[PDB]
Design a protein around this ligand. Sequence first.
Ligand SMILES: C[C@H](CCc1ccc(O)cc1)NC(=O)Cc1c(-c2ccccc2)[nH]c2ccccc12
Ligand SMILES: C[C@H](CCc1ccc(O)cc1)NC(=O)Cc1c(-c2ccccc2)[nH]c2ccccc12
Lengths: 228, 227
Amino acid sequence: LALSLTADQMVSALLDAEPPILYSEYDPTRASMMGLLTNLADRELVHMINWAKRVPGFVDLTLHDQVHLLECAWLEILMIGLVWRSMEHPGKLLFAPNLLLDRNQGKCVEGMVEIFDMLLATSSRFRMMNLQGEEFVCLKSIILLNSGVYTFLSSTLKSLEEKDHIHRVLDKITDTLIHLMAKAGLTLQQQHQRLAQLLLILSHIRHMSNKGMEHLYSPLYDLLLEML
Amino acid sequence: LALSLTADQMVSALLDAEPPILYSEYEASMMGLLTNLADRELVHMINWAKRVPGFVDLTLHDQVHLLECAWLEILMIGLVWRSMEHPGKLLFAPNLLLDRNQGKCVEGMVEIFDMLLATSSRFRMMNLQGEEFVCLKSIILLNSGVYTFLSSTLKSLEEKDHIHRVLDKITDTLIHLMAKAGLTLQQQHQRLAQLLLILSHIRHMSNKGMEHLYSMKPLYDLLLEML
Ligand SMILES: C[C@H](CCc1ccc(O)cc1)NC(=O)Cc1c(-c2ccccc2)[nH]c2ccccc12
Ligand SMILES: C[C@H](CCc1ccc(O)cc1)NC(=O)Cc1c(-c2ccccc2)[nH]c2ccccc12
């Protein structure tokens, strides 16, 4: 089980579990921004479930506890995926390697500009700190398990042994980061400061998710069930 | 300045800045009972913000964006912190203790209630000490709307760059607190994480609340006159 894995081990199996590069699908003999979003979000979804299930401990869960998470964390895992490949492309959003975008395109829809700009903003942010792929996967994980921990169902008995399992996985993923930046050669002080700005950027991505939701909402449960 | 303070020094001036406990103002309604009480808590927050080590160095535009972004978040963690010895209940004011059913008559408060109630339990379980709390409340002040000002012009660059160093300062403040406490450094690293990851749930709750607070449709005219 996950709760024996190592820093060394956790990273690797996390890199292992990475989804595949997905290429957009637009008229080459030429368009909508919406459908361009819908299309590939769908497909980015299907491979989430296949990565999620590869996250250590996510399986140890429950099908109900696994469906709540993903139903809460989905837009955030996309965003931090996007923002990661968008780093060497300042001012542009690298959805797919054949679908780099920028501001003016997000303005075509109805509220995408603000989300673009926060998106671009986190990209710059991560750019500044020089985010390693090894921390990125940690943080995609931490976005997964932290999604809807504190809103499962009830304070029952099982609910509690569950919550107790994630909180230990998360704790385990944390030593991974700390240990990653340790290897890197940072003084302990810089480990604690680095880890915090990283864990503070998660508030921003959550905030964009809710932001994003409000127009995506302006079924999914029944879908994750079949896939999970 | 804040970037000269020590842990004990930062704690002190943070403990120092702590606002006063407010009692509610009372067929009674939850809204006006709620509305009434935040306002007056807002007025004390503004005077608490102005006492946060480093917030002053910023700009009236960088000071008015922050507060205007993270207000609901400072209240919520402030409520959720006193609501800790009150399992299932939200201690708004010492005379306005509530629960789900108290929030149920208003049209959406239960969901915010429940998640509100859950963070309290979380804080309880981890045994959140006031000195880590005052720190986290500051961290929500500084993290508020950092990456969302407008432009990275000349001052914005030096400003955001200063914020990130205040926060870097608070960050070590907490560690020494848990360190002093005698945790393995590993235990310091987990706690700081379980702690800072809870700030997304407060943020997530704030965004929810906003959705409803503008479901009932100012601040600027206040922060400007009070700052
Ligand atoms: C810009 C982000 C999209 C993040 C994203 C989308 C697809 C992908 O492959 C990778 C990353 N969108 C939102 O935050 C909200 C959103 C809107 C949206 C925003 C504003 C107004 C209307 C619709 N349409 C969709 C469609 C699919 C996912 C998210 C979203
Ligand atoms: C339950 C939470 C916390 C509100 C709150 C108010 C005062 C205070 O000192 C601490 C916390 N409410 C909100 O986040 C949003 C909100 C609503 C609200 C939300 C949903 C439906 C109706 C009303 N009414 C008010 C009034 C004053 C401040 C915030 C709020």
